[PDB]
Amino acid sequence: VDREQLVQKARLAEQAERYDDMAAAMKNVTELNEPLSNEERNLLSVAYKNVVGARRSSWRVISSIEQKTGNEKKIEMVRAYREKIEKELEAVCQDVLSLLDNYLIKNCSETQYESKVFYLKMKGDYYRYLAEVATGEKRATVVESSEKAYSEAHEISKEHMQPTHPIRLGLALNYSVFYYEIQNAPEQACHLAKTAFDDAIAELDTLYKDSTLIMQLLRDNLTLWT
Template sequence: MGIPRISCPFYITTPPFLPFFLAFFDPQKHFAHFFHRFLCSIHTIMSTEKERETQVYLAKLAEQAERYEEMVECMKTVAKLNLDLTVEERNLLSVGYKNVIGARRASWRIMSSIEQKEESKGNESNAKLIKNYRQKVEEELAKICKDILAIIDQHLIPSSTSGEATVFYHKMKGDYYRYLAEFKTDQDRKDAAEQSLKAYEAASTAASTDLPSTHPIRLGLALNFSVFYYEILNSPERACHLAKQAFDEAIAELDTLSEESYKDSTLIMQLLRDNLTLWTSDLPEDGGDEIKTEETKPAEHEH
C-alpha cells in the first residue's frame, strides 16, 4: 500500500511572482547587506554610549572646576542624544543651567536696584548707563532661557519614560519661563507668565498622580510654583495656600519618607515654612492680593 498523497494546492502551483523574485534575489548579497546594517546599528549604539559617558564625565569635571558654561555644553550634548536621562544626568543639567542663569539673575537684580536709586536721585546720565548695561544682561538671560526651553521641548520631554522625569522637566520649564517673566515687560511678560503657569500646572497634575507628597521633586515644584504666584502673579494668598497645602500633605506622610530622600525632602519643607512665614507677614489685612514692599527674596528649589 503506497503512501497517500496529501493535496496542497499552494505547493502544487508555482506562485507567478517567484521566478521574478529569484531572478533578483541574491541570498549572499542580501545577507551581507543586512549584516552590515546590523553592525552599523551596534556601532552607533556603542558610539552613543561612549559619547554619553565622556560628556557626563566632562560635565562633572567642569562642575568641580566651577566652569558652568562648559558644564552646560556637555549636558546639552547628552540631552541631544534623545535618551532618557538618569537622575544624575538630570541633576547635572539642572545644576549647570542654574549656575549659569543664577549669576545673571543676581546681576540683574543688583543693576535694577542701583538704577532705581540713581533715578530717585535725579542722576539721569548714570541711570541711562545702568539701563544699557542691564539690557545686555537681559539679552544673556533671554538666550539662556530660550536655549534650555528648546532642549526641554525638543529632546527631554519626548524622551522621558517615567512620571518623575516628566514632573522634573515640566517644573524646569515653568522655572525658566518664570525667569523670563522676571525681567520682561508688557505683552512679553504676560506671555512668559502664561507659559510658566501652564508648565507648572502640567507638572502638578503629573506629580499628584505619579509622586508621593513627600517626594523632593514634588515638594520642590510646590515651592517654586508658590514663588511664581507670589512674585510673578502678585498673589500672596494663592502662594501661601499652595505652600501650606504641600507642607501639610508632606507632614501627614512623613513616616513613609524613605531614608535616601529624607534630607532633601525635609530641607524643602523647611524652605516652604520659611516662605510661609515671610509671606504671611505680607498679607494685607483686608485679605487682598496686593503685596507689601519686601526686600527679602523667597527661597527657591535649586534642582
C-alpha cells in the same frame, strides 16, 4: 568623546566652578537624543540653574543700581548694561526651554511621571525667569507659559507621586513662589505651600535629606509671607 566622557567633563566643570562649560556638556548629552539618568538630570538642572542664577543676580544688582541713581549719560550706560545682561539671561532661558521641548519632555514616555514632572517644573522655572525681567505687553505670555507648565506638573505629581517625594515638594515650592512673586496672589501661594507641607508632614514616617530641606524651604516661605 563618549557620553561617559561628556558626563565626566560636566563634573569636572562643576569642580572648577565653570558652570557655562558644565551646562554645555550636559546640553551635548541631552542632544545625544537619549533619556537622561537621575544623576544626569540633576547635573543638567544644577548646571543651568547656576548659569541662569549668575545672570539673575547680576540683573538684580544692576536694576537696583539703575533705580538708585540727574546724569543722563550715567543712566544711559546703566540701562545699556542692564539690557545687555537681560538679553544674556533671556538667551540662557531660551536655550533651556528649546532643550526641554525638543529632547527632554519629548522623549518622556506616557508613564515617566517623575521625569515629566521634573522637566515641566524646569519649563515653569525658566518661563518664570523670563517673566521676572519681562515688562509691558510681552510679559503676559511668558507668565502664562510658566503657569501652564507648573499646573500640568502639579496635576501629574498630585496623581502619581508621593507627597514627600522631593520633586513634588520642589515643584510645589516653586509653584507657590510663582504665585507669590509673579502673580501677586498670596492666597493661592500660601494655600499651595501649606497643602504641600501638610501633606508631606502627614506621611513623614515614609521617608530623605532633600525632602526635608525642601519642606524647610516651604515653611520659611510661609513664615515670610504671613
